[PDB]
Amino acid sequence: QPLAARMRPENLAQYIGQQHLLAAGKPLPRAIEAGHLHSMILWGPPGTGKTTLAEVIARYANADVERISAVTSGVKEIREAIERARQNRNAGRRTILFVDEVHRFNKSQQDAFLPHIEDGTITFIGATTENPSFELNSALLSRARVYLLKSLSTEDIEQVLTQAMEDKTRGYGGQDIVLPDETRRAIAELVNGDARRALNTLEMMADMAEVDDSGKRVLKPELLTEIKGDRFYDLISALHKSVRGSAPDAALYWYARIITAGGDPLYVARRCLAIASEDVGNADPRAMQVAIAAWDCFTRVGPAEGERAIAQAIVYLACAPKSNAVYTAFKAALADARERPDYDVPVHLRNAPTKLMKEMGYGQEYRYAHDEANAYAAGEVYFPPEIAQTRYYFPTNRGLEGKIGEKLAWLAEQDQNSPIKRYR
Amino acid sequence: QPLAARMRPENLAQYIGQQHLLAAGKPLPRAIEAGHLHSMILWGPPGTGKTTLAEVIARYANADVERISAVTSGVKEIREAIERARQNRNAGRRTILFVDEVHRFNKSQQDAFLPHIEDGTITFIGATTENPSFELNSALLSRARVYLLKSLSTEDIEQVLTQAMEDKTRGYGGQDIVLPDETRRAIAELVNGDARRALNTLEMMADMAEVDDSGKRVLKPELLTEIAGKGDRFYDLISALHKSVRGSAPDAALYWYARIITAGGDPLYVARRCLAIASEDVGNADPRAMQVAIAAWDCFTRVGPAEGERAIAQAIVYLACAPKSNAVYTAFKAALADARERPDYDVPVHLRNAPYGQEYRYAHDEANAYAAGEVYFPPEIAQTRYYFPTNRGLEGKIGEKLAWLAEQDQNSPIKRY
Amino acid sequence: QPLAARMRPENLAQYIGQQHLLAAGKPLPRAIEAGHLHSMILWGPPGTGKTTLAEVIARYANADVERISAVTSGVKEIREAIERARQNRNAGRRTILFVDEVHRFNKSQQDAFLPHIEDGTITFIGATTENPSFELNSALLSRARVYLLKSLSTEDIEQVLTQAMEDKTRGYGGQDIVLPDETRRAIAELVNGDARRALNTLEMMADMAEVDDSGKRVLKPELLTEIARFDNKGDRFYDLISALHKSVRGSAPDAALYWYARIITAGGDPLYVARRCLAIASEDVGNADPRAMQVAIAAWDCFTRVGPAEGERAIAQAIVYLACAPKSNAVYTAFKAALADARERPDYDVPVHLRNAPTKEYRYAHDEANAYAAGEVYFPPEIAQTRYYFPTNRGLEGKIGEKLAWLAEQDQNSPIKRYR
Amino acid sequence: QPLAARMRPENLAQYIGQQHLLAAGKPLPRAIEAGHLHSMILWGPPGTGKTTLAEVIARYANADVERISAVTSGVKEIREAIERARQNRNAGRRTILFVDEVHRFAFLPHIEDGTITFIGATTENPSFELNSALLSRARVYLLKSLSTEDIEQVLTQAMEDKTRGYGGQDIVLPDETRRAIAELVNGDARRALNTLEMMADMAEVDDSGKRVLKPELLTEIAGERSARKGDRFYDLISALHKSVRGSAPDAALYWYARIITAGGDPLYVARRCLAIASEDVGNADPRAMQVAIAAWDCFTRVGPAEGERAIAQAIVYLACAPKSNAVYTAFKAALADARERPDYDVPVHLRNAPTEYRYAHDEANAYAAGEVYFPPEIAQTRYYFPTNRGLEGKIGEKLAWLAEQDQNSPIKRY
């Protein structure tokens, strides 16, 4: 999904180097390239390419990978990983069980892996930032070689940054984003040998940068300088409420807050569709289209321009005439269908009533509305008789509902005056 | 498709309950773990995980699964499962045949299995809610070891519910639905050790619950007690809905729609009728109707049922309220009839694909962009008319325009034919 | 793609008829069930299930199928299926070559297959209607056992039809189509044992049938007595489309519905017509009614999601809408002239004031009176007074003409003028 | 994927020409059909089927092919291909490394361990500028210019293929223009297909949807001598945007035409049409965005020459539309405030649950008159200032009427 993950190297020529370990002709790379698996502990600061290296080892070995983290894993996910390796072994395939931050596992959680190492179900790759010998079972260490990874040189971070800019398919290649050398170095200066933070930054900058008239984004050093709980739900809530309250200004403010805090702007796009049916409904049917259009736009354009499309929709909705009459009408219909008995469809409304059914229904026949005056079957009743006198929908007088209210009032008269009435 | 099917456990660690049989170290876990395949009979109450066990077994053994029910399965269905398996065996794969409610099988229906266990084409797994040693051939019971499953403890159901709530990819994880522990317990006590029912209950709660201003559904206890309270009938409802919309009755329209949704009808089936209604009963009295119906469907496609259903209800009310005209519908119908019943006349010379109207009259170069007096029919049926706009909605203006054009045609010095 | 293809049986429990050869037990169904390939000839009258039986054999054997015809296949295609087989062999895959009307190859052209039979690059299955021992070498009769199939019973046909009706994945199982038993009979008689034709009929009926208020189609006996989309498109096809577009361009809804009806009933793809509707919307209507493009997109969207007869109508609604729309080719002619200008003139450089980022000036329009930089010129100086777009007075273009004339006056009276 | 790439033969029954090497019975065909790989150097003029021969061989041997050129390939992408190939061997798959324009260069050790089977392609005698270490492992093969007959067939094959070609796309290639294409290209297959493709892309669509590829169009394509994506392209876009913002439909069409005829991608223009819809029109005309979306949807479903016209329509529409950057600047200001002001809590009455709320539908005019939706610290913040253009006239009046309700309200926050 994110840039960091997308940009993961697939072979040793893309891997930006821990050259003291991987320089061609050395022992590790000879093993990797031969596809010779051995369990390992990888020790290195954040973003040294521990995760990615493990993935590369798997591809040379023609093996599968499962990743887990000692941070967000307890007994449940350990057993899951194990069992999954087990099925993969029964299908005849090899498995690398990668474990991030292994030192966070306690002795007994560490032990759970040895029978599966011993018995060939998995090759184990553990990654940490702390010293391995300090806090891992010696039983583990005796079966897993330790390798020391160093933080990257500036040259190498810069290389990681260019690789991402140049890649036409997984990176920003052919995407009209310019990374000036001055800012490439300034990111290198800041991230202190951490490549993941470096890709994160780049992506953050790409997301935040404004588009000029040519469609180009230039990631200036000035932009760099410039930089799911109840707090989040409350922000969504204040946005919705501002829109409902016809307050476009505050609405933008809440939207901006959700955006800058890393909220998904598609999440907000979904709320705009909901709001289109619940707070506007038929006072303005186009609102649904404005909201669909903003979604469609987000989906085809860069983040900052996408977010402006959604912004446009928020202000459209904040400004629109307001009606909860479809919402209230549909809630009441639901309640009746859930609470009232299962009334049959009256004969005159059935798809193809047989002549027996017609006679069982006391001569009652479908009245085709198009063949009657005004294409209205004045006096007809569309509810089962047990609930003939039912109204759910009360148009407001806002927007288009003004005229809807008049049409309905005029229909209701045609009904009252009709000489042919259902059920009477 | 449903939440119950989507949440099938894939391996032993996802599998909740049956510890009396499955606790690590016992015989069965170990044979499963080794993926060694043996024919079996599983005995237990509905929703105890018989179905899901046969599938976990299959996953460990790297085998394909074929499911039949001695209830909902004819001879044809049964011959199909065996042949499918036989093809698998021929390509070298391993197949499990899971048979639900096996007991409801006469002995001479049971015989039609054994050749298929014996020559390895099938590994057989029977499920039954009733004791096996009664109505099953001893030939079959002599080949299929019997296993007994209990109904689930309350803590078991709670875990099944929690597992479904947390699973992000197959469940409701990262989908802004909350399950308070109280209603977690309430469902546990309601279902009485049936996990299938437990998950359906959960699923029904989610589909029913209202979405708050933050997009959250909270699955309240109130909502739960509230819940304990495809042939002719389905089609009659669809028909009631359509006729109500045609009849400009928005209230009755929402009622029939609501009856369809809550009896488990697919709201997209309704969104399809809405599209049909927009062209058959509204047409060009209001061309925007079609776009309202489209948008409702797209809206449903992007936010799911919770609020999708409401967007379709908006489309329903819109169409109910909309000016009515079947003019396009009857015109098309009559055009198709001319095409089927009158000669297949060649296209007139002036209208063929060619690279005082002696040949083609490019209409943009004439007065008012209209080639007055030009006829676009073959001469044998010149003057044919299909489209008679009503005077409702936009068609008042359209009728006015066509009447103006027909006048230009009458006054034209240049008439075709 | 079509019903007769989708409904190809794929195992012996799906294959209908030929039970004198295939009933549970006999030599043949046991060879097949085991998956043992051997060369074969199928003798039988057209429609019997030769093509499909070879497919069923292929599936039980895990093998590819390459289909050829002594009648319809030229030399290129004969060579192509041999080569594909060779390719499958080098990847360790079995391949069956099915050869229709194989009796129509001579004694010498039949010889050409034996090298590939002998070295096991092909399992050969021929299909004839004329007797095998009659026109076929013994060089070949001795490698292929002969099996004999029978014109299907009108009763086998009914089963074929109900199978397609009741198939949820491949057929009409979940499409709300009812096939009354009288229609089932009536189709059986008409086709006279050709299962493929029975299915083609069934399909014609379902694409024909009207949708009732409940969304059902009922395949009534009368629709039958009222009676090919995959044919190459010839002169007639192209004239029907030209007619349709020209009727629409000429604001004639009735003639337009007629040609459209003619195209559909001749098997034309309604999506083809939908394409033309997107073209007409920009070419013949343009900005006299920009909503026209949306009407045409919706008909397309609606055809994608719904039944044929229903989607065909949504398209009909777009057709009538376009016929009735105000007419303007002004965006069309404007764009043609703009293109002609780009191709025929020097490739003038972007003027300084319109460049993206000048080095070491631009009038941002929103900051001027009226959000108009009155007096600015957006062409290069060499072609400063160029004009392509001449709105008509129809539809929306009346107001657009008014706005444009008012802006030109604004340009006329401005104190600031580019290139002065 | 151009037609050229798309139409690559997949076996020897599809491969056109080089009959001197490939006719049934000769040593090479046999070695190809058998599936047996030997390294090789292929020499012959551009577009004679060197690249496609190599692919065809790979398919018979059930191998992958790694394509590399001595011209455009750095030391890094060379190493990459070797790594991939190794990853292939390890997965049980054979690999052909194809080397375009080998003449300008020691891959030797990867040939022995059969991790790579090597196929070089060259327009110059092999023995000339590459050593005999390589040459003693790789048979040389002589490739010839295609005959007119051969080139006509390559065109017809492309005309008749339903899947990868132009079969059933309503394109007619008259035999006269097929002949002339053969005449102009001088035995080069790739160039033939590129010319076909060019004509397809440029041919006018008639009333029936059909394209006829006539000789006139051929002569016109030949007279195109213009030179062939940097600062120039960006200023063309800039000028288009600016002309649209300035309500000049004529200049806009001219810049759009310059972008198209220079080979720019029309969907790139479509993306700028979406951007413009929100930034320069906004809610003076919210239908503008649906117009751009529709043009885009249209381009997706139809020809190039037609989709391009729908994008033209959208450009003219935007150019004539009332202008407003009110949403654009309002949002920019909201984002600034968000970023630069403190992270104020959501005011209690606007939170999702309590730990107050004035449901607006339950009040007069469905408006909570006097409610405030900002945090107290920045109450009265304004971002959105509608213009008096297009729909924004009525929107300003509505907002002015609303704010007057707020002002006269007995219930006020704070």
Strand partners, A95: A64
Partners of C236 on chain B (C-beta within 8 Å) are 346-347
**CB D282 to CB A213 under 8 A?**
no
Within D203-357, where are the H helices?
Answer: 215-222, 231-245, 249-261, 266-276, 287-301, 304-320, 326-340
* C-alpha distance from residue A56 to each of A4, D43, D87, D115 (Å): 15, 37, 10, 19
CA distance B402 to B331: 15
CA distance D133 to D254: 58
* C-alpha distance from residue A399 to each of B241, C77, C319 (Å): 27, 66, 31
Backbone angles phi, psi at B146, to 5 degrees: -95, 135
* C-alpha distance from residue C163 to each of B70, C9, C27, C160 (Å): 21, 10, 26, 5
Partners of D352 on chain B (C-beta within 8 Å) are 212-214, 216
Contact (Cβ atoms closer than 8 angstroms) between residue A65 and residue A164: no
Crossing angle (nearest 10°) for helices D175-185 and D215-222: 20
**Which pair of structure tokens corresponds to residue B227?**
């819940």
Q: What string of H, E and C letters represents the secondary structure of B81-128?
A: HHHHHHHHHHCCCEEEEEEECCCCCCHHHHCCCHHHHHCCCCEEEEEE
Q: How many residues are given for chain D?
A: 414
**Which pair of structure tokens corresponds to residue A136?**
């891992």
- Among residues C57, C72, C126, the alpha carbon closest in space to that of C97 is found at C126
- Among residues A250, C12, B183, the alpha carbon closest in space to that of D378 is found at A250
Residues 6+ apart with CB under 8 A from A260: D335, D338, D339
- Among residues D361, B215, D273, D57, the alpha carbon closest in space to that of A324 is found at D361
- Among residues A57, A63, A48, the alpha carbon closest in space to that of A18 is found at A48
Q: Nearest by CB to A242, which of D271, D367, D373? A: D373
H or E segment and range at residue B177 = strand B177-178
CA distance D31 to chain A (A): 30
Strands A123-128 and B177-178: unpaired
Q: What string of H, E and C letters represents the secondary structure of A258-281?
A: HHHCCCCHHHHHHHHHHHHHHHHH
Contact (Cβ atoms closer than 8 angstroms) between residue A261 and residue A232: yes
H or E segment and range at residue C321 = helix C308-324
CA distance C395 to C331: 14
- Among residues D380, D385, D390, D386, the alpha carbon closest in space to that of D412 is found at D380
Backbone angles phi, psi at C57, to 5 degrees: -60, -50
> D198 burial class (0-12, 13-18, 19+ CB within 10 angstroms)?
middle
> C379 burial class (0-12, 13-18, 19+ CB within 10 angstroms)?
buried
Backbone angles phi, psi at C367, to 5 degrees: -90, 0
Chain C residue closest in CA terms to A366 = C213
Backbone angles phi, psi at C405, to 5 degrees: -65, -40
Residues 6+ apart with CB under 8 A from D8: D51, D52, D55
**Which pair of structure tokens corresponds to residue D17?**
């020409």
Give the CA radius of gyration of chain C: 32
H or E segment and range at residue C126 = strand C123-128
* C-alpha distance from residue B106 to each of B66, B70, B136, B137, C269 (Å): 21, 10, 8, 9, 52
- Is D221 within 8 Å of chain C by CB? no
Contact (Cβ atoms closer than 8 angstroms) between residue C103 and residue C136: yes
CA distance C39 to C63: 13
DSSP secondary-structure letter at D204? P
Which of B95, B336, B344 best tests the C interface by mutation, with the highest count of C CBs <10 A? B336
Collapse the DSSP code of B66 into the 3-class scheme (helix H, G, I; strand E, B; otherwise coil) and give the result. Answer: strand
Other Cβ atoms within 10 Å of B324 Cβ, number: 24
Instruction: Give me the residues of B, 387-416, that contact A with CB < 8 A.
Output: 390, 392
Strand partners, D41: D120, D140
CA distance C392 to C127: 65
- Among residues A395, A268, A408, the alpha carbon closest in space to that of A321 is found at A395
DSSP secondary-structure letter at A16? P
- Where on the phi/psi map is residue D25: left (φ > 0), alpha (ψ -120 to 50), or beta? left
**Which pair of structure tokens corresponds to residue C315?**
């398209």
CA distance D257 to C239: 32
Instruction: Give me the residues of A, 40-59, that contact D with CB < 8 A.
Output: 59
CA distance A235 to chain B (A): 8
Contact (Cβ atoms closer than 8 angstroms) between residue C391 and residue C287: yes
- Among residues B265, B243, B261, the alpha carbon closest in space to that of B252 is found at B243
**Which pair of structure tokens corresponds to residue C17?**
């008829």
Which of A59, A62, A246 best tests the D interface by mutation, with the highest count of D CBs <10 A? A246
CA distance C179 to C201: 12
CA distance A423 to A385: 7
* C-alpha distance from residue A295 to each of A1, A236, A308, B407, D299 (Å): 19, 17, 11, 47, 19
DSSP E strand boundaries for A180-334: 217-218
- Is C13 within 8 Å of chain D by CB? no
How many residue pairs bridge chain B and chain D with CB atoms within 8 Å of each other? 10
Q: How many residues are given for chain A?
A: 424
Residue matched to tokens 């979405």: B211
- Among residues D60, D120, D112, the alpha carbon closest in space to that of D89 is found at D112
Crossing angle (nearest 10°) for helices D304-320 and D266-276: 20
What domains does chain C contain, in order, with CATH numbers? 1-151 (3.40.50.300), 152-227 (1.10.8.60), 228-327 (1.20.272.10), 328-420 (1.10.3710.10)
Residues 6+ apart with CB under 8 A from A89: A95, A120, A121
Q: How many residues are given for chain B?
A: 417
H or E segment and range at residue D65 = strand D64-69
CA distance D169 to D163: 10
CA distance C126 to C135: 13
- Is C138 within 8 Å of chain D by CB? no
Q: What is the DSSP string of A99-111?
A: EETGGGS-HHHHH
Strand partners, D142: D43
Residues 6+ apart with CB under 8 A from A254: A235, A236, A238, A239, A242, D373
Residue matched to tokens 């049980």: D92
Residue matched to tokens 């945090």: D375
- Among residues A154, A196, A161, A197, the alpha carbon closest in space to that of A49 is found at A196
Strands D171-172 and D64-69: unpaired
CA distance B376 to B353: 14
H or E segment and range at residue D56 = helix D50-60
- Is B362 within 8 Å of chain D by CB? no
Buried b (16+ CB within 10 A) or exposed e, A265-300: beebbbbbbbbbbbbbbbbbbbbbbbbbbbbbbbeb
Subunits with 3+ C-beta pairs closer than 8 A to D = A, B, C
**Which pair of structure tokens corresponds to residue D13?**
């029954």
Collapse the DSSP code of C128 into the 3-class scheme (helix H, G, I; strand E, B; otherwise coil) and give the result. Answer: strand
- Resolution of this structure in Å: 2.5
- Is D132 within 8 Å of chain C by CB? no
**Which pair of structure tokens corresponds to residue D91?**
């997965």
CA distance C216 to chain A (A): 9
CA angle D23-D25-D31, nearest 5°? 95
Residues 6+ apart with CB under 8 A from D162: D168
**CB A90 to CB B60 under 8 A?**
yes
- Is C300 within 8 Å of chain D by CB? yes
DSSP secondary-structure letter at C65? E
Backbone angles phi, psi at B203, to 5 degrees: -60, -45
Q: What is the DSSP string of D96-163?
A: EEEEETTT----HHHHHTTS-EEEEEESS-GGGSS-HHHHTTEEEEE-----HHHHHHHHHHHHH-TT
Partners of B247 on chain A (C-beta within 8 Å) are 367, 369, 376-377, 380, 382
Contacts 24+ apart (CB under 8 A), A368-377: A368/B246, A369/B243, A369/B246, A369/B247, A369/B248, A369/B324, A370/B246, A370/B281, A370/B324, A370/B325, A370/B326, A374/A414, A374/B392, A375/B324, A375/B325, A375/B326, A375/B390, A375/B392, A376/A411, A376/A414, A376/B247, A376/B248, A376/B324, A377/B247
CA distance D14 to chain A (A): 32
CA distance C315 to C295: 9
- Among residues C158, C166, C202, the alpha carbon closest in space to that of C184 is found at C158
**Which pair of structure tokens corresponds to residue D20?**
């001197």
**Which pair of structure tokens corresponds to residue C319?**
């057709």
CA distance A13 to D76: 7
Collapse the DSSP code of A205 into the 3-class scheme (helix H, G, I; strand E, B; otherwise coil) and give the result. Answer: helix
Partners of D204 on chain B (C-beta within 8 Å) are none
Q: Nearest by CB to B299, which of A267, A273, A368? A: A273
Contact (Cβ atoms closer than 8 angstroms) between residue A98 and residue A51: yes
Contacts 24+ apart (CB under 8 A), A290-296: A290/A316, A290/A317, A290/D286, A290/D289, A291/A317, A291/B299, A292/B295, A292/B298, A292/B299, A293/D289, A293/D290, A293/D293, A294/A269, A294/D289, A295/A266, A295/A269, A295/B302, A296/D293
**Which pair of structure tokens corresponds to residue A37?**
């698996």
DSSP secondary-structure letter at A17? P
* C-alpha distance from residue C143 to each of C113, C114, C124 (Å): 11, 9, 9
Contact (Cβ atoms closer than 8 angstroms) between residue A234 and residue D346: yes
- Is B214 within 8 Å of chain D by CB? yes
DSSP secondary-structure letter at D283? G
- Among residues D326, D375, D340, D370, the alpha carbon closest in space to that of A315 is found at D326
Other Cβ atoms within 10 Å of D212 Cβ, number: 18
How many residue pairs bridge chain C and chain D with CB atoms within 8 Å of each other? 197
Backbone angles phi, psi at D120, to 5 degrees: -95, 145
* C-alpha distance from residue A62 to each of A36, A92, A178, B335, C31 (Å): 10, 12, 37, 63, 38
**CB C366 to CB D280 under 8 A?**
yes
Buried b (16+ CB within 10 A) or exposed e, D35-50: bebebbbbbbebbbbb
Instruction: Give me the residues of D, 316-335, that contact A with CB < 8 A.
Output: 327-328, 330-331, 333-335
- Among residues B202, B193, B201, the alpha carbon closest in space to that of B166 is found at B202
Contact (Cβ atoms closer than 8 angstroms) between residue A199 and residue A164: yes
**Quick one: CA dihedral D113, D119, D124, D125, positive or negative?**
positive
Partners of B294 on chain C (C-beta within 8 Å) are 298, 301-302
CA distance B195 to C257: 57
Contact (Cβ atoms closer than 8 angstroms) between residue C331 and residue D312: yes
Strand partners, D171: D211
CA distance A20 to A156: 14
CA distance D119 to D42: 7
CA distance D318 to D307: 17
**Which pair of structure tokens corresponds to residue A204?**
């953050």
Collapse the DSSP code of D69 into the 3-class scheme (helix H, G, I; strand E, B; otherwise coil) and give the result. Answer: strand
Q: How many residues are given for chain C?
A: 420
CA distance D124 to D118: 18
Partners of D243 on chain A (C-beta within 8 Å) are none
Collapse the DSSP code of C194 into the 3-class scheme (helix H, G, I; strand E, B; otherwise coil) and give the result. Answer: coil
Instruction: Give me the residues of A, 257-286, that contact D with CB < 8 A.
Output: 257, 259-260, 279, 286
Strands C123-128 and D117-122: unpaired
Contact (Cβ atoms closer than 8 angstroms) between residue C157 and residue C189: no
- Is A11 within 8 Å of chain B by CB? no
